[PDB]
Amino acid sequence: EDIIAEENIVSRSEFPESWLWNVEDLKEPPKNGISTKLMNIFLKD
Amino acid sequence: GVDRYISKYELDKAFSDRNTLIIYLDKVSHSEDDCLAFKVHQYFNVELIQPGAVKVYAYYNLEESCTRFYHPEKEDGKLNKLCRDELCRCAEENCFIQVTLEERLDKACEPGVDYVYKTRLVKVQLSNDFDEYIMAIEQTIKSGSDEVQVGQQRTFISPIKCREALKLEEKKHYLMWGLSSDFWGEKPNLSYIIGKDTWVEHWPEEDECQDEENQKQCQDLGAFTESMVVFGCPN
Amino acid sequence: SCVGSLVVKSGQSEDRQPVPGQQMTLKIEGDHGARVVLVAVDKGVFVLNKKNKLTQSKIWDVVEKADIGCTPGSGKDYAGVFSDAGLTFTSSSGQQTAQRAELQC
Amino acid sequence: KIVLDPSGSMNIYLVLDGSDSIGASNFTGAKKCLVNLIEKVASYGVKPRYGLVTYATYPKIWVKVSEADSSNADWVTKQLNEINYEDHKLKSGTNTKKALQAVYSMMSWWNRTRHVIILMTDGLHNMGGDPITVIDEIRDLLYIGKDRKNPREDYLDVYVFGVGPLVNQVNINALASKKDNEQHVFKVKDMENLEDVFYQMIDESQSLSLCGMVWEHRKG
Amino acid sequence: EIRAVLYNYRQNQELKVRVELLHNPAFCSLATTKRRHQQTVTIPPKSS
Amino acid sequence: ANNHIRTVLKLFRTIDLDDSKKSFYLTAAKYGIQTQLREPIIRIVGGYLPSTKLSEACVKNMISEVYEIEGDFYSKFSYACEDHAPYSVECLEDARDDYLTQLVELFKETKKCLRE
Amino acid sequence: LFIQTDKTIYTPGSTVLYRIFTVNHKLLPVGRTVMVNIENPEGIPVKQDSLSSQNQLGVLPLSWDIPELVNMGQWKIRAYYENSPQQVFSTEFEVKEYVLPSFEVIVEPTEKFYYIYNEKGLEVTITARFLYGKKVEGTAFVIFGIQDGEQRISLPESLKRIPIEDGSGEVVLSRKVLLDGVQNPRAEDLVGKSLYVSATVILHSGSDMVQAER
């Protein structure tokens, strides 16, 4: 029938209480003294 | 009623999804048993029912929870398991499964089975929750995870419920095989468990093979083992 | 308020509520040349306990508590006013503030 | 990962399954990758003691480690093409236990000689049982895991290749040793581009001083 | 000429819209009392 | 849309990652591909009227390029993983970032060719 | 020194990550040396470290693993500069048995006090919601206790079983209950004391309960 086979399903494993323990610098050139930096993070499960 | 209160949400859902129920008790008598009862029906009608449990605890605490399991067939409700001393093992399987010859070879050729033993029962011992069978190793049809060790006394373990299903007879030879999930314990006291994943079949002795049906069974088993020992199976 | 300005906001304009396992972009605005640290925690941790959490109010409370004067203006006299304000005024003529010898008033 | 030094004596044992389940198509690939491995490891100038054992039910012994000429790469690599998949036609079993017992007998006698085992089997075995017993016996032979100050875990490294169409990964993973930050199992699709599996296979702890080596993995 | 716009602001679902112009005695279009002016159009999602 | 979903699931059941690789690595890679290259396109292609036809060449390119991407991930797992310990969960967490980034870049590039 | 810890409760066997900020009296990054100590609730230092804030712009990341066999309570982190060992800065986390609850519980009285002569009595509003922004259904438990400094007195007759609907509910304590709960019927004696609300919220599914106290 119209159902996902039980082999294909993959379970959400990562269950962290805390994450994003990162330290980054704001080296992007300033605009009115307010630098802007974009990072691509992936949300935990 | 007085002293008991059930919220309306659990009261207005019908038979659809009322598999979990919560009852609030204002107080429970500390002198006698505050016994309450009601009826439960069956509608979905599925076999292999897991036991259901009740839970009691005060509102101000959660580690003082008394849990009990009830089930119509399992007496006190605990799941049927086999345990020796401290180390335990799961035994939630049927005692056994289920004549011609070709399917015997077809099933014996499977990769799951490793050891095939045609032995003789010497003595039968019973315990609190399991029974013991003494195996006299005569010859090994197909050596498995544990060798026959030339041939000595081997011990069995089976659920105590399975004793009523079938009673093994001492001095009676049997044809049977299992898998690597059978031997249990430490050398040289490994115990082979018998269940759904295993097989049981009685091979009467050559003297007892006199009957015509017994003649057919004995000759079929002899042909099976003669093919197995030398012809093998392409794997 | 902050001496600078640190603001965190989502890069995606509106979109939909993020799905687990889906990416998203964070836009951090701050003064140039500064190093930024980050940390993200589930809110269940905070509902289970929220004491001594780091915040700007605590920082300014500590800074204010670490002051040297403890009198909101005025005083008995010039020496008293100067001592309460947390300074010392010494002149060649001879005028001087009251001597202070205790760390906490 | 492996002991690779011309100044040290190492032992490499090659075993091939004669099971009818694998077929000749994968047997040719196994022979080709074995030839590639022997040619690559021999290219560093080392002359380890080798050995070939092909088994379906009764383990046939082709090359013994005790042979004086066994250190020659040419002899072993031309014995590799001598064997064929059709040699074990009468017996079509997959008795891994008997083959590992034969390896035990061949390795029966030293404390400073590294031993390497490489195996090719689909795992599905009718005859015999779990090869773990013979592995434990061989481990106890070299006195491994018996002293709290001298573990000596770098002398015995076993590898397995999961060559075959229908392969059960549970027993393949169980048979291979699980060490710290090392891999010991591989797949059929490694016949083409042997450099990928070979990069894990060979490490240069002290072989960087010499010259005459080159890597061809597309990953870098 | 006249123009009818069939907007569609759903999710990625596709719509097989059927639009018709009912006859009016005060106009002269292709729709009559017996015959009908029907079209079966398809609107890609988030389009017009 | 029901035939399209069956076609897409049939094409993703053709993926065959060697089981010899690490178990937790295999789960991480499978979860990444399932949540960044299956769920969005399955949702996209489930909103088509049955008349529309699919272009399976784009999904075949999907599979080929995701094989290349996973090969790159496994290469960074051990070879380029100089800073972190080889075959360590921390190294896997380090490389998961650019793995997922290039995967979603693939999906964004390939969305425009689903319908022919 | 500003000790920042990612969480506030840590299960045994889980690592702890804390960053130590170093600033001067002008609130600027400083390069100095920081002594770090971690003290268990009974006051026994367990792990001591030495650091230097040079070449990090006044940020010193750190980590530690809590052993399995530890005494749960109020753990403490103590840090002080080398030149002034007397000046000790503190920041406390705790170690406990917990699993993450699935919903916040907020008890917000209409007024942040209780007028003594208010015949209506204290009114408590329960606002429970799921963490991810969805409303909750279930039943709630409220008990009002009188706190006099370190002495806590409970009121058995104020226990009320209120049903929570759409994440909202109310309960009232009649002034008669407050007067009769304490043995003394005097009114002026109650001035200067305090009340607390110990609300327990339970789902209709019975998954778990959260004890929220104000």
What's the CATH code of the domain at G8?
Answer: 2.60.40.1930
State the residue range of the domain holding G141. Answer: 101-214
**Assigned token pair, G17:** 């990550």
Interface of B with G (CB under 8 A): 5, 7-10, 20, 22, 24, 55, 59-60, 62
Q: Measured between alpha carbons, how far is G39 from G70 in angstroms, rounded to an integer?
A: 12
Cross-chain Cβ contact D181/F86 below 8 Å: yes
Q: Based on the fold, state whether residues G50 and G10 are members of the same structural domain.
A: yes
Chain F residues 17-76 with CB within 8 Å of chain A:
27-28, 30-31, 34
Q: Is D19 annotated as a binding residue?
A: yes
Chain Cα centroid distance, residue G163: 26
Half-sphere exposure of B17 (CA within 13 A, CB side): 3
Phi, psi of C27 (to 5 degrees): -105, 110
Distance from CA of F86 to the nearest CA of D (A): 6
**What is the enclosing helix (H) or strand (E) of G36?**
strand G34-39
Chain C: give the shortest CA distance to residue A2, in Å. Answer: 23
What three-state secondary structure class fits G176? helix
Method used for this model?
cryo-EM
Chain C residue with Cα closest to G103: C44
- C2-65 placed in CATH 6.20.50.160: yes
Nearest to D126 among B109, B145, B146 (CB): B109
CB pairs under 8 A between B and D: 45
* Resolution value in angstroms: 3.9
Q: Which chains touch E (3 or more CB pairs under 8 A)?
A: F
Question: Do residue C51 and residue G8 have CB atoms under 8 angstroms apart?
Answer: yes
CB contact under 8 A, C22 and F35: yes
Tell me, letter by letter, the H, E, C secondary structure of B208-231: HHHCHHHHHHHHHHHHHHHHHHHH
Let me know: does D2 contact D203? Beta carbons within 8 Å.
yes
The hierarchical CATH code for the domain B78-235 is: 2.40.50.120
Q: Per the CB < 8 Å rule, is B7 touching G200? A: no
The DSSP symbol for E35 reads: S
Same domain flag for G106 and G211: yes
The residue of chain G nearest to residue B19, with distances taken between CA atoms, is G205
Question: In angstroms, what separates the C-alpha of F20 from chain C's closest C-alpha?
Answer: 26
* DSSP secondary structure letters along F16-59: ---TTS-HHHHHHHHHHHHHHHTHHHHHHHTTS-TT--B-HHHH
Vertex C15: Cα angle to C12 and C18 (nearest 5): 85
Q: How far apart are CA D11 and CA D127, in angstroms?
A: 28
CA angle G20, G22, G26 (to 5 degrees): 150
Prior bond of B188 cis (ω within 30°)? yes
Q: Where are the beta strands (DSSP E) in chain E?
A: 18-21, 37-40
| Contact yes or no, A with F (3+ CB pairs under 8 Å) | yes
Nearest to F104 among C19, C20, C23 (CB): C23
**Residue G167 DSSP label:** T
Is C75 near chain A, with CB under 8 Å? no
**Measured between CB atoms, does D91 come within 8 Å of chain B?**
yes
Verify whether the Cβ–Cβ distance A42 to F96 is below 8 Å: yes
Could you tell me the CA-to-CA distances from C14 to C10, C17, E11 in Å, in that order? 9, 9, 15
CA distance D181 to D100: 26
D207 is in an annotated binding site: no
Separation CA B49–CA B36 (nearest Å) = 24
| Residue in chain F nearest E10 by alpha carbon | F47
Chain E residues within 8 A of F52 when measuring between CB atoms:
14
Q: How many A-F residue pairs are in contact by the CB < 8 A criterion?
A: 24
Three-state secondary-structure class, residue D70: helix
What chain A residue is nearest to C27 in terms of C-alpha separation? A38
Backbone phi and psi for residue B11, each to the nearest 5 degrees, phi listed first: -95, -20
B25 touches chain D (CB under 8 A): no
Q: Which of C2, C31, C42, C47 to mutate to test the interface with G (most CBs of G within 10 A)?
A: C47
Contacts of E12 in chain F (CB under 8 A): 43-44, 46-47
Strands G73-81 and G9-10: unpaired
Contact G6 A23 (CB under 8 A): no
Q: Please, are residues D194 and D33 in contact by the beta-carbon 8 Å criterion? A: yes
Q: Which residues from G are below 8 Å from C16, CB to CB?
A: none
- Judged by a CB distance cut-off of 8 A, whether residue C38 touches chain A is yes
Let me know whether G10 and G108 are in one domain: no
Same domain, G44 and G110: no
Q: Return d(Cα G172, Cα G185) in angstroms, integer.
A: 20
Which spans in D7-155 are helix H?
23-42, 73-82, 96-107, 132-141
> Is D94 flagged in the annotation as binding?
yes
* Cα–Cα dist F83/C44, whole Å: 34
The answer to whether residue D92 neighbours chain B at the CB level (below 8 Å) is yes
Q: Which residues of G126-165 are buried (b: 16+ CB within 10 A; e: fewer)?
A: bebbeeeeeebebbbbbbbbbeeeeeeeebeebeeebebe
**G194 Rama sector, left if φ>0, alpha if ψ -120 to 50, beta otherwise:** beta
Structure tokens at B163: 């004793």
- For D25, the token pair is 């198509």
Contact: chain C with chain G (3+ CB pairs below 8 Å): yes
Q: Is D133 on the interface with B (CB under 8 A)?
A: yes
What is the total count of domains within chain G? 2
Measured between alpha carbons, how far is E42 from F49 in angstroms, rounded to an integer?
Answer: 9
G64 with G157, same domain: the answer is no
Chains G and D touch (3+ CB pairs under 8 A): no
Q: Which residues of F touch C23 (CB under 8 A)?
A: 100-101, 104
Single-letter amino acid, residue C81: V
Interface check for C38 against chain G (CB to CB < 8 A): the answer is: no
Residues G91 and G189 in one domain: no
Q: Which chains touch B (3 or more CB pairs under 8 A)?
A: D, G
Characterize the bridge pairing of strands G59-65 and G9-10.
unpaired
